[PDB]
Each structure stands twice: as structure tokens, then as C-alpha cells.
Structure 1
Amino acid sequence: SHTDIKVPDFSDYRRPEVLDSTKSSKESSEARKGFSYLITATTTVGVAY
């Protein structure tokens, strides 16, 4: 009965790069990571200013 437990999908939630089961996750990571960490970097620059 432990195998009767399935993940509810988050199709309303995931990024537009993550709207396909075909796509390799090792091929779309750096876009998401560079966007978010660029936001945090510009935040750090404003705080240091």
C-alpha cells in the first residue's frame, strides 16, 4: 500500500522550461539558476551601495 502513493503534479506551478517530461533537467538548470542568482546578486549590489 506504500506503492499506492503518487505525487500530485504541479502543472499550475512549474516554470515554462519545466512544462515537458521530455526535457533533461541537466540541460535547463542554468537558466533558472542564473536568473534567480542574478536577482540576488543585484540585490547584494544595491545593499552594498
Structure 2
Amino acid sequence: SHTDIKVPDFSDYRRPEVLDSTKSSKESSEARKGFSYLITATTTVGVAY
């Protein structure tokens, strides 16, 4: 049953930086984190001001 489960693929949605299946994502993690957290930080700075 569960061995027949095949996960769909989402390359229409993914980031183009992590379209590389082999190269592991312990490296470009802080890039995505700092990108989104910088956006939320700019948001919170504007709302606080």
C-alpha cells in the first residue's frame, strides 16, 4: 500500500536556487532564512515607525 505512494513534484513552485537535487541544502539555508526574515524585519520596522 504505502510502497505505492509516489510523491508529486513541485518545480513550478520551488526556488531556482534549490532546483539542484544532488547538492544538499545545508548551505543555502541561511540565504532563504535571511531573505524572508529581512522582508519581515522591514515590515515590522515600518509598522513600528
Q: Which runs of 5+ in 1 are unaligned?
A: none
> Which 4+ residue blocks in structure 1 deviate beyond 3 angstroms?
none
Sequence identity (%): 100
TM-score, normalised to structure 2's length? 0.91
Instruction: Kindly report which structure 2 residues correspond to 1:22-37, keeping only aligned pairs within 5 A, or say none.
Output: 22-37=22-37
Gap runs ≥5 in structure 2: none
Of structures 1 and 2, the one with the larger relative CO (CA 8 A, separation 6+) is 1
**RMSD over aligned Cα atoms:** 0.8
TM-score, structure 1 as length reference? 0.91
